[PDB]
CSV table of C-alpha atoms and ligand atoms in Angstrom, one decimal:
chain,number,residue,atom,x,y,z
W,1,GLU,CA,-10.3,15.8,37.6
W,2,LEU,CA,-6.6,14.8,37.2
W,3,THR,CA,-3.7,16.9,36.3
W,4,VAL,CA,-1.4,15.2,33.8
W,5,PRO,CA,2.3,16.2,34.3
W,6,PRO,CA,4.8,16.5,31.5
W,7,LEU,CA,5.8,13.1,30.2
W,8,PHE,CA,9.3,11.8,29.4
W,9,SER,CA,10.2,11.6,25.7
W,10,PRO,CA,13.8,11.3,24.4
W,11,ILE,CA,12.6,11.9,20.8
W,12,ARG,CA,12.8,15.3,19.1
W,13,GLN,CA,9.7,16.9,17.4
W,14,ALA,CA,9.3,16.7,13.6
W,15,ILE,CA,6.6,17.3,11.0
W,16,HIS,CA,6.1,17.1,7.2
W,17,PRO,CA,6.2,20.6,5.7
W,18,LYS,CA,2.8,20.1,3.9
W,19,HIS,CA,1.0,19.3,7.1
W,20,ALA,CA,-1.6,22.1,6.6
W,21,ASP,CA,-2.5,20.9,3.1
W,22,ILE,CA,-2.7,17.3,4.2
W,23,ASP,CA,-5.1,18.3,7.0
W,24,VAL,CA,-7.4,20.1,4.5
W,25,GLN,CA,-7.3,17.1,2.0
W,26,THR,CA,-8.2,14.6,4.7
W,27,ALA,CA,-11.3,16.7,5.7
W,28,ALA,CA,-12.3,16.7,2.0
W,29,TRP,CA,-11.8,12.9,1.8
W,30,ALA,CA,-14.1,12.4,4.8
W,31,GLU,CA,-16.8,14.5,3.0
W,32,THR,CA,-16.3,12.8,-0.4
W,33,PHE,CA,-16.8,9.3,1.1
W,34,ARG,CA,-19.3,10.4,3.8
W,35,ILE,CA,-17.2,8.9,6.6
W,36,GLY,CA,-19.2,8.8,9.8
W,37,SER,CA,-22.5,10.5,10.7
W,38,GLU,CA,-22.7,14.3,10.1
W,39,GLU,CA,-22.1,14.9,13.8
W,40,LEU,CA,-19.1,12.6,14.1
W,41,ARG,CA,-17.5,13.8,10.8
W,42,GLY,CA,-18.0,17.4,12.0
W,43,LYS,CA,-15.8,16.6,15.0
W,44,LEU,CA,-13.3,14.5,13.2
W,45,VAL,CA,-12.3,17.1,10.6
W,46,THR,CA,-11.3,19.5,13.4
W,47,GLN,CA,-9.0,17.1,15.2
W,48,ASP,CA,-5.9,17.7,13.2
W,49,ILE,CA,-5.6,14.1,11.9
W,50,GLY,CA,-3.6,15.2,8.8
W,51,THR,CA,-1.2,17.1,11.1
W,52,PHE,CA,-0.9,13.9,13.2
W,53,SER,CA,0.0,11.8,10.0
W,54,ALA,CA,2.5,14.6,9.1
W,55,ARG,CA,4.3,14.0,12.4
W,56,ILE,CA,4.4,10.2,11.9
W,57,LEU,CA,6.0,10.5,8.5
W,58,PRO,CA,7.9,13.9,8.6
W,59,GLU,CA,10.2,12.9,5.7
W,60,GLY,CA,7.8,10.5,4.0
W,61,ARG,CA,6.4,10.7,0.5
W,62,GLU,CA,3.5,13.2,0.5
W,63,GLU,CA,1.0,10.8,-1.2
W,64,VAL,CA,1.6,8.3,1.6
W,65,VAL,CA,1.3,10.9,4.4
W,66,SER,CA,-2.1,11.7,2.9
W,67,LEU,CA,-3.0,8.0,2.6
W,68,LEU,CA,-2.1,7.5,6.3
W,69,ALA,CA,-4.1,10.6,7.3
W,70,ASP,CA,-7.2,9.3,5.4
W,71,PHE,CA,-6.7,5.9,7.0
W,72,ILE,CA,-6.5,7.3,10.5
W,73,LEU,CA,-9.7,9.3,10.0
W,74,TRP,CA,-11.4,6.1,8.6
W,75,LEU,CA,-10.2,4.2,11.7
W,76,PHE,CA,-11.9,6.8,13.9
W,77,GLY,CA,-15.0,6.3,11.7
W,78,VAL,CA,-15.0,2.7,12.8
W,79,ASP,CA,-13.7,3.0,16.3
W,80,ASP,CA,-15.9,6.0,17.3
W,81,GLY,CA,-18.8,5.4,15.0
W,82,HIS,CA,-19.4,1.7,15.7
W,83,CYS,CA,-17.2,0.5,18.6
W,84,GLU,CA,-17.3,3.3,21.2
W,85,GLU,CA,-20.3,5.5,20.3
W,86,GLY,CA,-22.4,3.1,18.1
W,87,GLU,CA,-24.9,0.3,18.7
W,88,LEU,CA,-22.6,-2.4,17.3
W,89,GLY,CA,-20.1,-1.7,20.1
W,90,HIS,CA,-22.5,-3.4,22.6
W,91,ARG,CA,-23.0,-6.4,20.2
W,92,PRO,CA,-19.7,-8.3,19.8
W,93,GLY,CA,-21.3,-10.9,17.4
W,94,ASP,CA,-22.9,-8.3,15.1
W,95,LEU,CA,-19.7,-6.3,15.2
W,96,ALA,CA,-17.7,-9.4,14.3
W,97,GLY,CA,-19.8,-9.8,11.2
W,98,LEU,CA,-19.4,-6.3,10.0
W,99,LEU,CA,-15.7,-6.4,10.5
W,100,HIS,CA,-15.3,-9.8,8.6
W,101,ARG,CA,-17.2,-8.2,5.7
W,102,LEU,CA,-14.9,-5.1,5.8
W,103,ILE,CA,-11.8,-7.4,5.7
W,104,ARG,CA,-13.2,-8.9,2.6
W,105,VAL,CA,-13.7,-5.5,1.0
W,106,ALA,CA,-10.1,-4.6,1.8
W,107,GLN,CA,-9.0,-7.9,0.2
W,108,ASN,CA,-11.3,-7.6,-2.8
W,109,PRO,CA,-12.8,-4.1,-3.5
W,110,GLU,CA,-14.4,-5.5,-6.7
W,111,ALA,CA,-16.6,-8.0,-4.7
W,112,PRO,CA,-20.2,-7.0,-5.1
W,113,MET,CA,-20.9,-6.7,-1.3
W,114,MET,CA,-21.4,-3.8,1.0
W,115,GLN,CA,-21.9,-1.6,-2.0
W,116,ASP,CA,-24.0,0.9,0.0
W,117,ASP,CA,-21.8,1.4,3.0
W,118,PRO,CA,-19.6,4.6,3.3
W,119,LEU,CA,-16.9,2.9,5.4
W,120,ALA,CA,-16.6,0.2,2.7
W,121,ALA,CA,-16.4,2.8,0.0
W,122,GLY,CA,-13.7,4.6,1.8
W,123,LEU,CA,-11.9,1.3,2.5
W,124,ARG,CA,-11.9,0.6,-1.3
W,125,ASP,CA,-10.2,3.9,-2.0
W,126,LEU,CA,-7.6,3.2,0.7
W,127,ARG,CA,-6.9,-0.3,-0.7
W,128,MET,CA,-6.4,1.1,-4.2
W,129,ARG,CA,-3.8,3.5,-2.9
W,130,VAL,CA,-2.1,0.8,-0.9
W,131,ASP,CA,-1.8,-1.1,-4.2
W,132,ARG,CA,0.1,1.9,-5.7
W,133,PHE,CA,2.6,2.4,-2.9
W,134,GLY,CA,2.9,-1.1,-1.4
W,135,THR,CA,4.1,-4.5,-2.5
W,136,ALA,CA,1.8,-7.5,-2.4
W,137,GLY,CA,3.4,-8.5,0.9
W,138,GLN,CA,2.9,-5.1,2.5
W,139,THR,CA,-0.8,-5.2,1.3
W,140,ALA,CA,-1.3,-8.6,2.9
W,141,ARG,CA,0.4,-7.4,6.1
W,142,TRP,CA,-1.9,-4.3,6.2
W,143,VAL,CA,-5.0,-6.6,5.9
W,144,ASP,CA,-3.6,-8.9,8.6
W,145,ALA,CA,-3.1,-5.9,10.9
W,146,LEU,CA,-6.6,-4.7,10.2
W,147,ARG,CA,-7.8,-8.2,11.3
W,148,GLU,CA,-5.7,-7.9,14.5
W,149,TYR,CA,-7.3,-4.6,15.3
W,150,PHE,CA,-10.8,-5.9,14.4
W,151,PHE,CA,-10.5,-9.0,16.6
W,152,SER,CA,-9.3,-6.9,19.6
W,153,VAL,CA,-12.2,-4.4,19.4
W,154,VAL,CA,-14.7,-7.4,19.3
W,155,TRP,CA,-13.0,-8.5,22.6
W,156,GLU,CA,-13.3,-4.9,23.9
W,157,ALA,CA,-17.0,-4.9,22.9
W,158,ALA,CA,-17.7,-8.0,25.0
W,159,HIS,CA,-16.4,-6.0,28.0
W,160,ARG,CA,-18.6,-2.9,27.1
W,161,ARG,CA,-21.6,-5.2,26.7
W,162,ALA,CA,-21.0,-6.8,30.1
W,163,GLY,CA,-19.9,-3.4,31.7
W,164,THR,CA,-16.7,-5.2,32.9
W,165,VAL,CA,-13.1,-4.1,33.1
W,166,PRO,CA,-10.4,-6.6,32.2
W,167,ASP,CA,-7.4,-7.3,34.4
W,168,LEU,CA,-4.0,-5.7,33.5
W,169,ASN,CA,-2.7,-8.7,31.6
W,170,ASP,CA,-5.8,-9.0,29.4
W,171,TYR,CA,-6.0,-5.3,29.0
W,172,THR,CA,-2.4,-5.1,27.8
W,173,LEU,CA,-3.0,-7.9,25.3
W,174,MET,CA,-6.2,-6.2,24.0
W,175,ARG,CA,-4.7,-2.7,24.0
W,176,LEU,CA,-1.6,-3.7,22.0
W,177,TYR,CA,-4.0,-4.2,19.0
W,178,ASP,CA,-7.2,-2.2,19.7
W,179,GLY,CA,-5.4,1.1,19.2
W,180,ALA,CA,-4.8,0.0,15.6
W,181,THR,CA,-1.1,0.9,16.0
W,182,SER,CA,-0.1,-2.3,14.1
W,183,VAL,CA,-2.0,-1.2,11.0
W,184,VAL,CA,0.1,2.0,10.7
W,185,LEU,CA,3.4,0.0,10.5
W,186,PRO,CA,3.2,-1.1,6.9
W,187,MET,CA,2.5,2.5,5.9
W,188,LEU,CA,5.7,3.5,7.6
W,189,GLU,CA,7.6,1.4,5.1
W,190,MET,CA,5.6,2.5,2.1
W,191,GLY,CA,6.2,6.1,3.2
W,192,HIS,CA,9.9,5.7,2.4
W,193,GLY,CA,9.5,3.3,-0.6
W,194,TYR,CA,11.1,0.2,0.9
W,195,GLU,CA,10.0,-3.2,2.3
W,196,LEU,CA,11.1,-4.6,5.6
W,197,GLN,CA,11.9,-8.2,4.9
W,198,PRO,CA,10.3,-11.1,6.9
W,199,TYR,CA,13.7,-12.3,8.3
W,200,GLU,CA,13.9,-8.9,10.1
W,201,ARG,CA,10.3,-7.9,10.4
W,202,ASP,CA,9.2,-11.2,12.0
W,203,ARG,CA,12.3,-11.6,14.1
W,204,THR,CA,11.1,-11.8,17.8
W,205,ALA,CA,13.2,-8.8,18.9
W,206,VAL,CA,11.9,-6.6,16.0
W,207,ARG,CA,8.3,-7.6,16.7
W,208,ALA,CA,9.1,-6.7,20.4
W,209,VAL,CA,10.2,-3.1,19.7
W,210,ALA,CA,7.2,-2.6,17.5
W,211,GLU,CA,5.0,-3.9,20.4
W,212,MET,CA,6.9,-1.5,22.8
W,213,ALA,CA,6.0,1.4,20.4
W,214,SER,CA,2.4,0.2,20.5
W,215,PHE,CA,2.5,0.1,24.3
W,216,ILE,CA,3.9,3.6,24.6
W,217,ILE,CA,1.5,5.0,22.1
W,218,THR,CA,-1.6,3.5,23.7
W,219,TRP,CA,-0.5,4.2,27.3
W,220,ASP,CA,0.3,7.8,26.3
W,221,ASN,CA,-3.2,8.0,24.7
W,222,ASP,CA,-4.7,6.4,27.9
W,223,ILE,CA,-3.1,9.2,29.9
W,224,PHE,CA,-3.9,12.1,27.5
W,225,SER,CA,-7.4,10.8,26.6
W,226,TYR,CA,-8.4,9.9,30.1
W,227,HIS,CA,-10.1,13.3,30.6
W,228,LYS,CA,-12.3,13.1,27.5
W,229,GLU,CA,-13.0,9.4,28.0
W,230,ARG,CA,-14.0,9.6,31.7
W,231,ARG,CA,-16.2,12.7,31.1
W,232,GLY,CA,-18.2,10.9,28.4
W,233,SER,CA,-21.6,9.5,29.2
W,234,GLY,CA,-20.9,5.9,28.2
W,235,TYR,CA,-18.5,3.0,28.8
W,236,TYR,CA,-14.8,3.7,28.6
W,237,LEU,CA,-11.7,1.6,29.1
W,238,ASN,CA,-8.0,2.6,29.6
W,239,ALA,CA,-5.0,1.7,31.7
W,240,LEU,CA,-5.9,4.0,34.6
W,241,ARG,CA,-9.4,2.5,35.0
W,242,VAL,CA,-7.8,-1.0,34.9
W,243,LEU,CA,-5.1,0.0,37.5
W,244,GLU,CA,-7.8,1.5,39.7
W,245,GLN,CA,-9.7,-1.8,39.7
W,246,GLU,CA,-6.8,-4.2,39.9
W,247,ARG,CA,-4.7,-2.4,42.5
W,248,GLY,CA,-7.3,-0.5,44.4
W,249,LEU,CA,-5.9,2.9,43.4
W,250,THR,CA,-7.3,6.4,43.2
W,251,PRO,CA,-7.3,7.9,39.7
W,252,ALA,CA,-4.2,10.0,40.8
W,253,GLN,CA,-2.4,6.9,41.9
W,254,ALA,CA,-3.4,5.0,38.8
W,255,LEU,CA,-2.0,7.9,36.7
W,256,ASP,CA,1.4,7.7,38.4
W,257,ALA,CA,1.5,3.9,38.1
W,258,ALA,CA,0.7,4.2,34.3
W,259,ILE,CA,3.4,6.9,33.9
W,260,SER,CA,5.9,4.5,35.6
W,261,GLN,CA,4.9,1.7,33.2
W,262,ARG,CA,5.3,3.8,30.0
W,263,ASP,CA,8.5,5.4,31.3
W,264,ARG,CA,10.2,1.9,31.7
W,265,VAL,CA,9.0,0.8,28.3
W,266,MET,CA,10.2,4.0,26.7
W,267,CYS,CA,13.7,3.3,28.2
W,268,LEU,CA,13.7,-0.3,27.1
W,269,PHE,CA,12.5,0.7,23.6
W,270,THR,CA,15.4,3.1,23.0
W,271,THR,CA,18.0,0.6,24.3
W,272,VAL,CA,16.7,-2.4,22.3
W,273,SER,CA,16.2,-0.2,19.2
W,274,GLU,CA,19.9,0.9,19.5
W,275,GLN,CA,21.0,-2.7,19.7
W,276,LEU,CA,19.0,-3.7,16.6
W,277,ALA,CA,20.2,-0.7,14.6
W,278,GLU,CA,23.9,-1.5,15.1
W,279,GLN,CA,23.9,-4.6,12.9
W,280,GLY,CA,20.5,-4.3,11.1
W,281,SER,CA,19.9,-3.6,7.5
W,282,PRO,CA,19.5,0.0,6.3
W,283,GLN,CA,15.8,-0.7,6.0
W,284,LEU,CA,15.6,-1.8,9.6
W,285,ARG,CA,17.4,1.4,10.6
W,286,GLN,CA,14.8,3.5,8.8
W,287,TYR,CA,11.9,1.4,10.3
W,288,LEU,CA,13.3,2.0,13.8
W,289,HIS,CA,13.5,5.7,13.1
W,290,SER,CA,9.9,5.7,11.9
W,291,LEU,CA,8.8,4.0,15.1
W,292,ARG,CA,10.3,7.0,17.0
W,293,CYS,CA,8.5,9.4,14.7
W,294,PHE,CA,5.2,7.5,15.4
W,295,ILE,CA,5.7,7.6,19.1
W,296,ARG,CA,6.6,11.3,19.2
W,297,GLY,CA,4.0,12.3,16.7
W,298,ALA,CA,1.3,10.7,18.8
W,299,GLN,CA,2.7,12.5,21.9
W,300,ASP,CA,2.7,16.0,20.3
W,301,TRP,CA,-0.8,15.4,18.8
W,302,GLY,CA,-2.1,13.9,22.0
W,303,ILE,CA,-1.5,17.2,24.0
W,304,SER,CA,-2.7,19.5,21.2
W,305,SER,CA,-5.7,18.0,19.3
W,306,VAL,CA,-9.1,19.3,20.4
W,307,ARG,CA,-10.0,15.6,20.5
W,308,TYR,CA,-8.1,15.5,23.8
W,309,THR,CA,-7.9,19.2,25.0
W,310,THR,CA,-11.8,19.4,24.6
W,311,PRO,CA,-12.1,23.3,24.6
W,312,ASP,CA,-15.8,23.1,25.8
W,313,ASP,CA,-14.5,21.5,29.0
W,314,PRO,CA,-10.7,22.1,29.0
W,315,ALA,CA,-8.4,19.3,29.9
W,316,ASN,CA,-5.5,20.0,32.2
W,317,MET,CA,-2.6,19.2,29.8
W,318,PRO,CA,1.1,19.7,29.8
W,319,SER,CA,2.6,22.0,27.2
W,320,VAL,CA,6.0,20.1,26.9
W,321,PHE,CA,7.7,16.8,27.3
W,322,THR,CA,10.7,16.2,29.5
W,323,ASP,CA,14.0,14.5,28.7
W,324,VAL,CA,14.3,12.6,32.0
W,325,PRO,CA,12.1,9.7,33.2
W,326,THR,CA,10.4,9.4,36.5
W,327,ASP,CA,11.0,5.7,36.6
W,328,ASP,CA,14.5,4.9,35.3
W,329,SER,CA,14.7,1.3,36.6
W,330,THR,CA,15.3,-1.8,34.4
W,331,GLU,CA,12.8,-3.8,36.4
W,332,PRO,CA,10.3,-5.6,34.1
W,333,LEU,CA,6.6,-4.7,34.3
W,334,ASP,CA,4.5,-7.1,36.3
W,335,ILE,CA,2.6,-8.1,33.1
W,336,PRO,CA,3.2,-11.7,31.9
W,337,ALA,CA,2.1,-10.8,28.3
W,338,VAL,CA,5.1,-8.4,27.9
W,339,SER,CA,7.6,-9.0,30.7
W,340,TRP,CA,9.7,-11.1,28.3
W,341,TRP,CA,10.7,-7.9,26.5
W,342,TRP,CA,13.3,-7.4,29.2
W,343,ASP,CA,15.0,-10.7,28.2
W,344,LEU,CA,16.2,-8.9,25.0
W,345,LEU,CA,18.7,-6.7,27.0
W,346,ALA,CA,22.2,-7.8,25.8
D,401,3E9,C1,-3.7,5.1,19.8
D,401,3E9,C2,-3.4,6.5,19.1
D,401,3E9,C3,-3.6,7.8,19.9
D,401,3E9,C4,-3.1,6.6,17.6
D,401,3E9,C5,-2.8,5.4,16.8
D,401,3E9,C6,-3.0,5.9,15.3
D,401,3E9,C7,-4.3,5.3,15.0
D,401,3E9,C8,-4.3,4.1,14.0
D,401,3E9,C9,-5.6,5.9,15.5
D,401,3E9,C10,-7.0,5.3,15.2
D,401,3E9,C11,-7.8,5.3,16.5
D,401,3E9,C12,-7.6,4.0,17.1
D,401,3E9,C13,-8.4,2.9,16.3
D,401,3E9,C14,-8.1,3.9,18.6
D,401,3E9,C15,-7.1,4.5,19.5
D,401,3E9,O1,-7.6,4.3,20.8
D,401,3E9,P1,-8.7,5.2,21.6
D,401,3E9,O2,-9.9,4.4,21.6
D,401,3E9,O3,-8.3,5.3,23.1
D,401,3E9,O4,-8.7,6.6,20.8
D,401,3E9,P2,-9.4,7.8,21.4
D,401,3E9,O5,-8.6,8.0,22.8
D,401,3E9,O6,-8.8,8.9,20.7
D,401,3E9,O7,-10.8,7.8,21.6
D,402,MG,MG1,-11.1,2.9,20.9
D,403,MG,MG1,-11.4,5.9,21.4
D,404,MG,MG1,-8.0,6.9,24.4
């Protein structure tokens, strides 16, 4: 049983003032569309997902904060319900089929397929609201990000089926998408009523800082969710387990290695973000601000949600974040998939 120390975060807390209302409405949405089994849904509605969304978009439009909250709950419906606690999570092929069908539902809610499925019904509601607050381009990017996430959990499912653990490079590539962090990004834009244009959005350096945010968010989750994940009865995967296997480390040593990794990415993220903001559009400056909100929102939620603190078997969690890193170096991570990020330092 590991003790997680306070993690470094240079980002101040913030939350949308209607967080309480949003959390209630998300629970009601889950019931209306019957998302997940009765057992899963009963857990999900207590995990403060609305509160989490409120921290991601603290000054966002209330309707989009609610959309994002509903979407996060829906994603847990897929990720818990099928991938990690369902039969399809051991069957990559069958999972691939379900997920292709769901993509089609997102693209065309009017198509007469999966008319019986609660997840499909919820997805249709989400798509119709994306249509309200998003452009055609943002809607297509949302679908593409859903496909990214889906493809990556099919890859994760192959490891669960085989009972194997990927090496660090493969895990990093998989984890950059299997946390669904990329699907949230279009809603960051919609939350503030703007569109980040392709010439900025798809610029390598801008993709890079988005990937860094994804890395920090998923590593922070790997750290804070290690307790609930390891104590489960089934297969689990996270950075600590990968580091244990690859480097022959104890869980405690793996924790320290993972903290060092996310500390260095946090430092790089702030530096490269600052560079980009100096001569970026006003829209890019807002997008970069929202990436900070997403990173910090996930941090505050990660140490407080009953999803991670698990009251029936209390996790040893920090109560605060620190303003100084443990690893301050500019040495790149020994991970080929992301070590190029450090080339962006001007
Ligand atoms: C990654 C994060 C904390 C928030 C991102 C916001 C978001 C889109 C959450 C949906 C859940 C996602 C699909 C899995 C996260 O990983 P995992 O399988 O480790 O989640 P679990 O640790 O909560 O079981
Ligand atoms: Mg997962
Ligand atoms: Mg999970
Ligand atoms: Mg986790």
